[PDB]
Amino acid sequence: QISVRGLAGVENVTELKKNFNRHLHFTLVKDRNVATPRDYYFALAHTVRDHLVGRWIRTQQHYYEKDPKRIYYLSLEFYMGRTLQNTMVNLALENACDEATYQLGLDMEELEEIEEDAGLGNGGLGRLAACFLDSMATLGLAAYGYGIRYEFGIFNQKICGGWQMEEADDWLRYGNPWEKARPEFTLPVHFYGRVEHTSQGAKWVDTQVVLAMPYDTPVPGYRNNVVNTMRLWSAKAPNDFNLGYIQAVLDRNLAENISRVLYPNDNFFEGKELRLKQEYFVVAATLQDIIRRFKSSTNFDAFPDKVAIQLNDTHPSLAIPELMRVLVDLERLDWDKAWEVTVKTCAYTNHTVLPEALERWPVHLLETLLPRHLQIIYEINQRFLNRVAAAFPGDVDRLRRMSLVEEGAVKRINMAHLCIAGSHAVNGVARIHSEILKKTIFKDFYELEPHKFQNKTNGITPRRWLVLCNPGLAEIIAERIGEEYISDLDQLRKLLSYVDDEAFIRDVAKVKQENKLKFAAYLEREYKVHINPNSLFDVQVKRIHEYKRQLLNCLHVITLYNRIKKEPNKFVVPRTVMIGGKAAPGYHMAKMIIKLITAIGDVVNHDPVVGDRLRVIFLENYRVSLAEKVIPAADLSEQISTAGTEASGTGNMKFMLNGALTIGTMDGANVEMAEEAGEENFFIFGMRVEDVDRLDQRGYNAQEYYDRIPELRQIIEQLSSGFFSPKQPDLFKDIVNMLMHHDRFKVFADYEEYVKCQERVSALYKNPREWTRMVIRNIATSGKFSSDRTIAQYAREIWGVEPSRQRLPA
Amino acid sequence: QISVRGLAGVENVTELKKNFNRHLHFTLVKDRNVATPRDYYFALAHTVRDHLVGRWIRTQQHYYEKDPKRIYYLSLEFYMGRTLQNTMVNLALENACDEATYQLGLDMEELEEIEEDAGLGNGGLGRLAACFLDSMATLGLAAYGYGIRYEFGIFNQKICGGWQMEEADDWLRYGNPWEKARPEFTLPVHFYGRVEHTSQGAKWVDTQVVLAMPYDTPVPGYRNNVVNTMRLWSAKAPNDFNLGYIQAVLDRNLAENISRVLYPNDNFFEGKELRLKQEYFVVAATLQDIIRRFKSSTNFDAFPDKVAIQLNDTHPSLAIPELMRVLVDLERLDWDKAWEVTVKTCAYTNHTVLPEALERWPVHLLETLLPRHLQIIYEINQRFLNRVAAAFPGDVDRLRRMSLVEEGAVKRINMAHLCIAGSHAVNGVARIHSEILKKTIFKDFYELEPHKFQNKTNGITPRRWLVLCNPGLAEIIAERIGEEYISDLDQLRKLLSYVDDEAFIRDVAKVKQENKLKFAAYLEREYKVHINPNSLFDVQVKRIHEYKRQLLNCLHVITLYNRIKKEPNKFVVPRTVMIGGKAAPGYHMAKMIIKLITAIGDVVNHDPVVGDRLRVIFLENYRVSLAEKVIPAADLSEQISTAGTEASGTGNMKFMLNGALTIGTMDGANVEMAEEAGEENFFIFGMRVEDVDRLDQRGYNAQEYYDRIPELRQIIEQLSSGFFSPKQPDLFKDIVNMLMHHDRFKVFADYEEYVKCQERVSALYKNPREWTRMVIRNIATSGKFSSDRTIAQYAREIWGVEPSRQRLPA
Numbered sequence A, B: 001q002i003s004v005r006g007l008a009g010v011e012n013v014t015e016l017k018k019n020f021n022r023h024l025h026f027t028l029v030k031d032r033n034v035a036t037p038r039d040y041y042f043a044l045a046h047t048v049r050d051h052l053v054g055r056w057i058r059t060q061q062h063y064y065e066k067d068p069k070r071i072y073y074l075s076l077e078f079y080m081g082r083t084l085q086n087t088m089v090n091l092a093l094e095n096a097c098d099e100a101t102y103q104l105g106l107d108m109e110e111l112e113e114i115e116e117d118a119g120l121g122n123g124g125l126g127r128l129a130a131c132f133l134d135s136m137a138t139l140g141l142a143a144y145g146y147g148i149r150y151e152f153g154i155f156n157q158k159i160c161g162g163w164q165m166e167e168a169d170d171w172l173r174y175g176n177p178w179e180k181a182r183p184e185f186t187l188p189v190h191f192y193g194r195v196e197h198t199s200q201g202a203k204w205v206d207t208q209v210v211l212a213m214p215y216d217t218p219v220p221g222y223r224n225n226v227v228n229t230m231r232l233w234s235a236k237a238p239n240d241f242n243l244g245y246i247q248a249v250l251d252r253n254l255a256e257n258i259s260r261v262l263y264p265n266d267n268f269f270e271g272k273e274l275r276l277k278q279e280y281f282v283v284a285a286t287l288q289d290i291i292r293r294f295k296s297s298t299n300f301d302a303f304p305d306k307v308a309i310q311l312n313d314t315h316p317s318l319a320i321p322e323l324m325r326v327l328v329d330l331e332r333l334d335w336d337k338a339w340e341v342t343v344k345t346c347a348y349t350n351h352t353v354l355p356e357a358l359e360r361w362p363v364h365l366l367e368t369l370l371p372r373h374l375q376i377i378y379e380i381n382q383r384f385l386n387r388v389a390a391a392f393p394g395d396v397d398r399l400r401r402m403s404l405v406e407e408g409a410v411k412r413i414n415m416a417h418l419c420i421a422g423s424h425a426v427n428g429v430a431r432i433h434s435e436i437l438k439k440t441i442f443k444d445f446y447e448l449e450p451h452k453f454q455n456k457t458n459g460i461t462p463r464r465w466l467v468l469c470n471p472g473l474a475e476i477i478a479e480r481i482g483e484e485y486i487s488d489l490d491q492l493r494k495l496l497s498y499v500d501d502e503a504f505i506r507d508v509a510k511v512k513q514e515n516k517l518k519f520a521a522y523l524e525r526e527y528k529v530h531i532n533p534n535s536l537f538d539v540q541v542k543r544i545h546e547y548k549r550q551l552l553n554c555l556h557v558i559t560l561y562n563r564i565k566k567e568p569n570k571f572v573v574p575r576t577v578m579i580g581g582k583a584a585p586g587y588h589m590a591k592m593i594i595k596l597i598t599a600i601g602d603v604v605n606h607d608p609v610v611g612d613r614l615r616v617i618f619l620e621n622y623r624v625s626l627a628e629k630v631i632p633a634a635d636l637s638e639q640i641s642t643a644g645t646e647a648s649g650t651g652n653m654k655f656m657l658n659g660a661l662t663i664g665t666m667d668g669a670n671v672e673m674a675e676e677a678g679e680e681n682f683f684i685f686g687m688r689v690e691d692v693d694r695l696d697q698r699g700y701n702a703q704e705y706y707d708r709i710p711e712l713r714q715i716i717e718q719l720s721s722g723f724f725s726p727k728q729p730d731l732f733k734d735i736v737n738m739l740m741h742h743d744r745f746k747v748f749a750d751y752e753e754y755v756k757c758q759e760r761v762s763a764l765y766k767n768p769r770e771w772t773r774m775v776i777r778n779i780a781t782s783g784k785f786s787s788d789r790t791i792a793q794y795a796r797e798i799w800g801v802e803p804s805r806q807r808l809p810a
């Protein structure tokens, strides 16, 4: 049907059909009379997977012979979403499979909807890891994702009575056809025990052994025949384990619980033992695998020329003392040499500056669980602090601030401080976030070693985030400028010479309309609720957090409502406000915010006076495959974090790419996006970082905004008095109390500018042609936000390897 | 190479090779340079499984259209062993796969050794269930095995320092290519809750739901293209389960523990809740599946014409109140009609008379776990006892003996009494065992309903137990009489006219020699110990139990040893005594017996005076695939249970079929075997059942045998005094104490006759030609012990269906 989806050849379509029928028969043990759509999804899924393996096998063979430097991306999170469509797209099989399945009398899109999301992460950091793997495979790097095969991923969110309910995400119930178990490469991981000293060094003894079994998932590059590996470890008990009898077998579960469930806290640290175990387990099994591959080429001077390890936040920071451990205690290198190898091998990415999100492990935990690693850490700290003392003699305060060991209540280990000391490079994830690291939380570190600190502004893969979710837009872009932009997103600049092209304007606007129609029906079919598709689609989707200021959004919504009710017969640009995201199960405020949003909907959506003019919808179970649907349908993207709090953001980039305009603050990558498109093409409002500091110095008093802004006073009174919850008039006391007395994020400070900026959006929306020309100018300057650009900079400036766009032979 | 192994056609061999290479590539994601033997086993395993599916699909289709009565075999045990060779044999693929794999440069036998045993049972009852499924598929019955998919089967036994150590049997580590998960037919099973009464009947409410997910394993008939189904349920938590958050997800394991491990007690009841849960779970999910298949043809009068349920011991006896429950509470039939349907549907097989093996569930357990089923049981009992009262008015003692409810200490439910009351047929498993049921433990029941009681003497499948484990013997038999005996084992009678054929005598003896050579090397390769292959191979393999009297065997061994030492330079027929079997983890005596046997070996096997004349070996980890190796290699089969205790035995039959002679007591099926071969062709010794009763009436005093038999006195003194354990002189005090003061099994009473009978065996062994002619006479009369005969009688006399030998189309 559409050209960017590839050739439907007569040979290929005929081949696909025969293999589909083969799998239905041999693999699924079914035939046409008893097959459900699920069986059809699987038969297609095995058929498409067949095209990967040949490529997968020769990619691993190529690396064996060429021996390039390997990149190891360690993350506790890989937020992959669905694999089938992405695999078709990267293999150029999409139209052929559509044809093949149409001829068998099936609808391929209906089949895609059956695949479970791999929800092996929380939000932005997990999903960046997914974009990175796609980009790495596309740029031909010999790269491996390593993580944990969680049996349950982020919980499924249901709303019952307006409240979030959590339900276990049993994503493996039906099988995962993409993974290949590899029990032959199972590795021991050790816990507890104690440290013995001998003539020939320290020894770690009396340990419990947990086994780590790997599962490999293929990662296809874009049309280049490269297929890389994402290897995820699963926990397994050894067979003499605990080995009265029945109970011993049942207790094998204690050891396997390591890989059972993903922790659902995002931007918040929770110091639980089970979490530390997961952190050690991924790092222990991964380093053994790394060292094993290295030995199959004695000589560790060359280890940094053959190995790069990227740490995704501090979650795998134990890589650092672990590699010291293996090199010092097992390979018998001296300290100084092992340390040089370590620093040269590891590099660290920070993702946040929020103090509650930083990992600070109690010493009593590490002592019990990892007694040797604690020793190594004390030794790293001592030698590090001697470089500090010697560079800043007499500065005793610097020493306590820079220590990897926090003193106080309970002693803690600051894992960020460890990652900086043991890495040759530390990066933030957007330019402003990188400067903030240098000026604030890591300033001492930066003065010590300026050369370690870099920026690598985040990006998204245009394969998933454009070609896959938005074929309509991809196609019309391809009609004008060719297909080459799919792996060179800079080429979208050529779209600027079409900003005054009448036919392009109508096409860009036609695609948005279609996506809106499609999403509007998806709302009615799968969740039974009605939206006007002619309204502006105002969407905020991201995890629920105080810093992300969904509350700011709520206050605007209430304002629009109170303005309609005051002057009912006045024209207002109609809007569908959609807000979605999961709250971490123990984040009480976040749960309250979800309840507020649905309460606003209960009132606004049933006011006959309001009519079709304002709708508020909470989008349940926001996840990757729901993002692929709502994002193409959006007109307005809300990125309204308090300046200085959103390290980068990546949702923002998805929306710029897919033809929504952005309202947001000068925060994170918003700054670079407005810089690329021009500030006039962006709706910027509110305090800058500097204003926030000015307000902190003198103190934030929210009463001041409540006394001066009668529109805001009225909202608060309505909140306090039971307007939104007539059966529990005091239901929202916590929210009001917080807003009034301890808002760490200054919601009221931005309120006025926000509402005013929002009237400018409605005004531009009244002029469709000029709304669309602004859209064209956003889309055409989103090139910089491709994760291909991001990974090319990591490759040249951190890893020391060169990308290449070159096909391997088929 | 050998004809009973089928055609190696040029088409088939070429096909097998291309599919093997396909699986190695697509399914295993490997190629020739990195493949291990394990990968080769799997590639063959998937290739052979491909030939099953077409047959599997049309067998299930045939049953749908013909609608024959279905047989449902419920068992908590299916002791399957390995599947690959058995599948080749029943499909006639064996020579073709040998060829195909030889041409790829592999050794197929070396590949077969990699397959894990499916050890989903304990011993004789579990393995009978396996023979039955093969026979049922071979005789074309529409039959389903139903059970539990245990994640760990019978433990692997290791001997450390002569003691049994247990190790978890992780049979699924590497995958099971034979099973097909069927998550689409998952069914709820309920526990706990309470009973509510309404206007329209009893209701079971507030229950915990456990989900039962089925796995289907194909069961191929012999060369008839029938493929039946063995369906095994796995336990799964529902998704709102327990649903602070982390702990809720981790606790999903409590529900899944139901299918985690097989209980390892054989001939011994253990009243643990987890066991009762497993019993209910298999019966609850199975009946729903049965009723579902029945509805897809309102009318339950015809249920018994479309459904038969066989209960394998009382482990699934809850089928009876469960079917009452569903029919009465859910389908709303009246009691009397539902009961008639139940009785007409169910039938019950007893496997033992040992009082400690009988299931007697505490009432307080059933009350908590299954409150409704307890009510139904009380109602069954009341109405049953009114038929007793009315048939035997005034007999108050009969009433208390026949009650399903035992009074006493704690009230219990006698599950045997329940199975008899709710079944139209009750059978023993050998003729003598069936008479013993009628005369002793079930006498009251028999006087009430004589017509329920039947016999169905056990059998073994000649596919596994001859063609598969002993191709040598199968072949030479086939040379003389054709192939037809493989599914009509009666034809072995024709072998009698060859008892004086010189060439046959030499062939039968050549096969035994080869099997002995092969097994003797298997001992050196895989367990590093040396045996003379010219010795008589004296083997006792079966679970370790006091009633099986391995101790009797031990006393003979010590006697032979003390006789060699007394007159060292006298000729004795040399022997290799092998004894093997697992002890249940809490059966202290059984563990002591294993230790005794290895202690005897430590002494006997290192006495230079003894030399090559006597060796004692304990065969570690006795299991199905070890039975397939030792049984063909045996000369002497030891079946020496105290008369009246071995319900039937089936090891005995394996040995008769494979050319060993039998020494044993007139117990179980030994009686029918000696009757078939002639008593002169069998080494019978010891008390009969009647002698045992005579000795009980007057009392068993073991001191009497110790005072009169100086050879026995000396053994006991050696035991007591530390001869066999010089570092713990009192190590065996428990065994001696037991033997002397409370032997429920009268080891000494049989000792004299045993030793004398054993000299007769050595004497026949000195004359090879006459030993072999006796062998030929055993083999030729083993026909009756085929499970095809057993199942044909079940079919005609219990189930009301006719067998057929007819091919389905290919």
Ligand SMILES: O=c1ccn([C@@H]2O[C@H](CO)[C@@H](O)[C@H](O)[C@H]2O)c(=O)[nH]1
Residues within 6 Å of the ligand: A122, A123, A124, A125, A126, A128, A265, A266, A267, A268, A351, A352, A357, A429, A458, A646, A647, A648, A649, A650, A668
């Ligand atoms: O715990 C955390 C800490 C940070 N991030 C996000 O990382 C993304 C990837 O770099 C950023 O774009 C986003 O700003 C940040 O909050 C998370 O998603 N979870």
Ligand SMILES: O=c1ccn([C@@H]2O[C@H](CO)[C@@H](O)[C@H](O)[C@H]2O)c(=O)[nH]1
Residues within 6 Å of the ligand: B122, B123, B124, B125, B126, B128, B265, B266, B267, B268, B351, B352, B357, B429, B458, B646, B647, B648, B649, B650, B668
């Ligand atoms: O718990 C038990 C009770 C009995 N049997 C055996 O059943 C076989 C099959 O019928 C019999 O041949 C054997 O005598 C009996 O002990 C067991 O294996 N386990």
